[model samples]
Target: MVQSSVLGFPRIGGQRELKKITEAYWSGKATVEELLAKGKELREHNWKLQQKAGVDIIPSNDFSYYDQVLDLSLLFNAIPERYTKFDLAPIDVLFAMGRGLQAAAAAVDVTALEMVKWFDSNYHYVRPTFSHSTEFKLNTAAGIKPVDEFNEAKALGVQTRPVILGPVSYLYLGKADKDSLDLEPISLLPKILPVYKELLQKLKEAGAEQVQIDEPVLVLDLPEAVQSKFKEAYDALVGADVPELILTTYFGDVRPNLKAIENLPVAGFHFDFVRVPEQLDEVASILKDGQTLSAGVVDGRNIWKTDFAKASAVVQKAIEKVGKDKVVVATSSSLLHTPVDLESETKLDAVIKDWFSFATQKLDEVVVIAKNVSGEDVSKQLEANAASIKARSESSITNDPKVQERLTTINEALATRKAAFPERLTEQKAKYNLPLFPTTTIGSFPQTKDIRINRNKFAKGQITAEEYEAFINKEIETVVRFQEEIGLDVLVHGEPERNDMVQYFGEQLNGFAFTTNGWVQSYGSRYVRPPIIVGDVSRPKAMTVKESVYAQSITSKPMKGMLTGPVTILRWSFPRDDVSGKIQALQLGLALRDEVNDLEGAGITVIQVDEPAIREGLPLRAGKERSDYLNWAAQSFRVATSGVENSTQIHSHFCYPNHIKALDADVVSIEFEFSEYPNHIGLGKQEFVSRIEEILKVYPASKFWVNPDCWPEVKESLTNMVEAAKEFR
Candidate 1:
């Protein structure tokens, strides 16, 4: 029989209990043992949830106290000298690497490793680093995680597939610690593969039948050397005294390395039918007789309802190549990228509701696909799925004629500013009096516990809408007063009402569905529940106007009207797969254009629309594809902000400068606090000045604010900002 399985489940608890506990522990409010206990409970609950959803071959070791990459770093004893030199406890060392160890505590001043985008996804992994002289050992901690998780699942009566990052992908995703080092990270394969082998052997001993080794790098344009390493590493791993190994690849097509992977001794292979449907022809040609084929037919990265008719065809093709027993249905990737259960959404409009699937609902899709492809009696399940599709497609909430008309009418004038940067800057300076070396923050203060408690209370109806609005207003008042006291040149309302910049806007707009408990881990203990954009989007009401107007009333400083731009909202949310991202982004842009005009009308002079996810949304590589994306993406931002006059200053912020190419912005505030490379604080004083000067060639002087400060401690990052600003002027 064909079976359905999930590659992995969301580790952050459905209610985000793990985030709360981990934060409490980090803040010294809870003990380490308390945190560990919470983690264990969450894992057991997660495993049970998957089993209850009728998932076969449930995955283990997907849970992490921090990031999985960091876990592997600790496991293999791949820690840098600075962290190890302090002679700290194991957990302390791990935390230090994740979020730099300060000198007062450890006497060693070391920043964390360079973190970049995780492929096209919003999730981030701690990037691994390799030095020329790096050596490896069979670190017990690394091997213990899979064994422990497997045992935990087994105790719960769930048969599981242990998941490990394949050796070649691990090395390929990592980088050398220093520059001018001729050693390719892949050269360390000889040392790394043994640890993987030992870990597989340990999982076998722990009662695991098969392991899923993910080599997603095969989907990328690989150098010939890295392709050769795939053959070498898997050869060593497949021959180990362990259960069957299912080589898994996702995110894109693996046609590039089909020849190399086909030759491996693995018992089964998994490919994402959702992402690389065209690759099936290649997959059929290469599959060995008697080998199993795991067909990932369900949509894991998106929120749209699974088109079972389309999915069944993909699975049928795979079944034709490999018989019933040799074929299985699974998610395109781990449901980590998707939100949790749809059951938690109590208030969604029924029409749009049927069109969506969170992690839990996606499991149901998996089961139906499996049964249908295997010729099992799935008539009832198929009927239910069909009904849902019809309900959503026919829902009034799913269609917006007004938004459609506006999108159709979009022109060049809407996407271009009246004047270029130089003229606009001069007009802005004359309109709003300011001092030299102005100080501002990146639109949020510390999201204190009180704010979250009040928000939660409001959501549960424990507090009235009036009460919630008043509470949010009070927080804004406090933030405004504090910024004035701190002597900041510009001020923000601190976003006390916003759970997340993107999700907050999505909730206020049309064509979006939000979950009460849906949370996905962004990194470590931090989790964000992204709203699912299900249909044509329009702004039903102004999302951030009240807070911005109130904050402006209290502060003499020019209050920046903060909004998450079109690209960011689209990137952060689980966008609709049926529509082009560009079209969806344009819809959001029109909505934001209204907000920008409203803010200007409300007497707000300075407006900052943050697009931190822009870099994260860029095409993986440069070419016509990247250019096409940038054209619309840039237009989307311009359309949103260009509605305002030149005097109404426009500012844009981005997080990682390295991942995104230098795009034209009137005033660009980059995240400069974290070093992308060792000893390379992002865009130092000279570089900042040079960049500003270059930008001024096209734009005006008033069109720029080089923000070195991001979040947490604005005072600490102020030194860098002061230097950058002074040098630039």
Candidate 2:
């Protein structure tokens, strides 16, 4: 019979236990012993959850206090000199590397390693920085997490497979440090392979029979040197008398780099058939004798229930080629992108709730597909899945005739602004009369504890709607007064009333669903419950007009209206799988267009629609597909902001500065060399002014706008920023 497997499970407990304890430890409220105990508890709970779900091939070492890639960096002793000098505990050192540590009393201050999007997902991983003094050895003091977690599962009588990021992919995912920018990351492969070998041997000694080594970078466009290093690294790794290795790839097709992994002496291969199902034939044909094929037919990156018939067909095809004994059914990728359980969402509508599945439900999905393919009695599951799929397709809520008609109205004229930037800038400059290097924020102020408490009270009906509005109004007044006191050139509403940039809008939109506890981690201790786009998106009323108007009424400075752009709203949410992202984005574009027009009409002269997720939304590999995505994505931005008049001073902000030109906004605020990590707070006034001067020398004064790399939290930081801007003016 074919077996079932999960690549990984969500480490955050159903109620976000890991996030709570880890944050407590960070704030000095919990001890390291307590932190370790919490970590072990979460791991054991995750392992047992999968075991009880009837999963055959449970995986260990997929949990992380921060991120899996950063865990590997610490495990392999890839410590940069700056971080190693802190002389902190092993766990503290790990946290320091992930999020920089600053302890004035302890005389320790170090910036964190840079973080970037994990491939095409919203999840972020810390980039491993390679320097000339890098040494390769396993840091046993940090504890071999993989081995320890495997033993933890075994002690509970649950035999499992250990998952690891492969050697080649690890090097490829990292970058060179500032001191050694000339050093190529892949060249360090020879030095790290021995450490991988030793680690694998230890897993073998721990009684692990199979190891899942993920080489996800094989799905990307590869350079020749990097491609050649895969075989060399794997050959040395397999020679360590270790457990059987199962190489895995995900997110895109691996055919482009097939020559790199051809005929490697691994036991089997895992392919994300849900992403590119057409590649099954070629990949299965290349499998060596006795090598199993793990068919990832369940959708792991999304929330929709699997189409059982389709997944079973894919598994059957794999079985036909590799034989049922050499076939395993699994998820397309790790369940890290998805929420923990659907059962926690008690308040969601029953109809839409039936159409969804979370990480726990997806485990059953993998099992049902495997059992049906292996000739078991799973007719009930198959029938239920078919019914749910049919219900979603035929449901009246999924399609809005008005939205469809509006989508047809989107043409070249609708996507382009009424006037070009030069014409618009002239009017904007005259209207606002702002100084050069005008300083402003990125639309949100710090959401203090009081704000959350008021919002929560309003949510639970403990306070009346009038009371909530009065509270929100007071917040807006305070933020406006604060911005004026800081001598800010352009002001903002500070977004104190909004919960999340996407969720706030999503709550008001006509075709979105909310979850009471659908939290997924964005970074260290930060979690977001992305609203599900259940159907065609349409705005029922003005989402931000009331708040923006209230904020502008109290402030003499130009109060900027803030909104989350279409691509960001779509990318951050778990959108419908049946619809194309382009159509959904365009549908969202029409809704936000209304909001933007409303903001402009309300005398808010400046508006900012943030598109920080756009760069990550670009296709992983370069091709016509990539070009096509850029085309529609840029058009989506224009579709949102084009309705405003020439003098409205439309703005967009992105953390990455490279892709700003395509959006064609009148003014773009970007990260201006204040360092990428949030822990780096040593920007003296001289350095701040010099960086602005350097930027002024490169770009013309009229075209450039100044903002921090992110929003400033402290009043002193904002004061220094405004003071620095005065010099540039």
Candidate 3:
């Protein structure tokens, strides 16, 4: 019989309960006692749900008050002295590491530790800081969330498989201070593995029959040093006194890294069978006799319901090759990227609703597949799943004749400008005529408490439309006035009406299905409500023009009309799997072109199209496929901004400004404070000047604008970002 398992569960609760509660704690509305209890509640509830759904090998310690990697950093005692200096509660210090605390009435101000990209996903992990002075200890006092969570689950009569980040991947994702570039992160593994040996012993004593040490770094092309060290690493943990160890890897094939882990002493090995099918045939050949195989047959990143027939076939193949008792069916990766549950979505239509599955539904998906593979008559649920998948594929709502016609008829001129950048520069400089280095701001001014309460009231129908609009207008006015007062050359409407960039556009478009509960962490504690595309998209009305025109009317300083570009909208959205991303990106371009044309029509001059996820959309591995993707991406942007007159300037904001050669925007702004997330950066005028020099070397003709990079929320904004930027001026 095939056993069923999940890699990890979503930590954020249904309707963002965790985010709401954590913020409540942050603001002093909730006590530490309350928050800690809620953490247990969310964890126990998650375990019960997974057990109820028939997960044989349930996972623990995947939960976090912040990020999982940060949790691991603390467990290993890899603390930067800057954070430990602040003698806050252990939990407060944890929050400080994730989101830096500002100098409030009660708290001492501290810089948040650095966080950066988690693989290619939008989710971020606290960049684990290490130094030359960093020492390895068993960290007996560091404590363990996994052991506690495992025992807590055991008390509930659910013997869960405790999960820990594999020591190789933990250090692979971490960092050493710039000054300690001479010391490699992996070289510290010898020091780090003893803690793992100790922790494994604790879990076994706590009655863990099995443990999952996730070495997801195996999925990527690993370094020779890491590949060679796999034996020494696992040898320490899986030696004499530990519980059964299952070494897991996912999201890609362990093709190369498999060579290293071949006959290492461990209980089982898991492969991401969904993302890389070639692994299924090859993986069986590599495994030694009596070794078990956990085959990840279900898709975890996507929302589309598992195709029962396809999944069943994959599971059967694994069973046949690896023997029935040794095969376990699992997800391609963790369900943390997915929403908490699907039962909360009351507004979705039956058209595409049944085609979707969140974390809870995904648990059922893997379970049902396992049951059917093991000779159970679960035809009713399997048939229902097939029908749902079929309905979405054949739905007429997907076939938009208008979109088809637009695709066939290419307005090639729209993708290019009649006037050159130099021509646009002459007109733009003449129109504004202020400074060689002009100052402006990226659009989102702070969403104050008043704004949040009013939006909530309006959402609940407790406030009138007139009341909400008037309040938003006041916010726009206040922010505009503040910018003008601060001598900002270009002005902004401050995006008060927007809830989220993609969700804002989705609310105004025809083809999106908005979720009341679906939310994912983009970075830090900041969460994003990602909109799902269900059918062919079209704009019902202008999305941003109303806000833009209102602000432009109030300001003589050039109010740059802000909009999220098509590439970003498609990138950020939970886009329909039924449609190709290229097509959806094109659809978004057409929809946003109408909005941009309307904004330009309504007398909004420079339109700033923000595309922070543009880099995120690049192909994972480069080839002609990458070149083709870049062309499609650029074409999508061109269509999004092309309807304007020659003088209607387009400003596209993105990351990696140092590598930036050019943009469609004649008027542009950027900061190389590593381009985004301005925190704990030790940049001075000398370095800032060097970066500016590097940027200019690529495009000498490129015009640059400036923004005051501060809010009390973004720590180090005033002191680190502002003072340094001002020194350059």
**CA lDDT of each candidate?**
0.78, 0.85, 0.77
Candidate 1 whole-model C-alpha lDDT, 0 to 1: 0.78
Best-fitting candidate, scored by TM-score:
2
lDDT of 3 by residue, 68-121 (tens): 888877777787776776567666767888888676565677777887776656
Task: Provide backbone clash counts, one per model.
Answer: 5, 0, 1
Model 1 scores worst on lDDT over the 10 consecutive residues at: 673-682
Alpha-carbon lDDT of model 2: 0.85
Candidate 2 off by > 4 Å: 85-87, 433-437, 657-659, 673-684, 687-698, 711-729
TM-score (all chains, Cα) for each model:
0.85, 0.93, 0.88
lDDT of 1 by residue, 614-665 (tens): 7677875456667888888878888888887878877776664442232234
| Predicted candidate 2, C-alpha RMSD | 3.8
TM-score of 3: 0.88
Give the better candidate number (2 or 3) by lDDT. Answer: 2
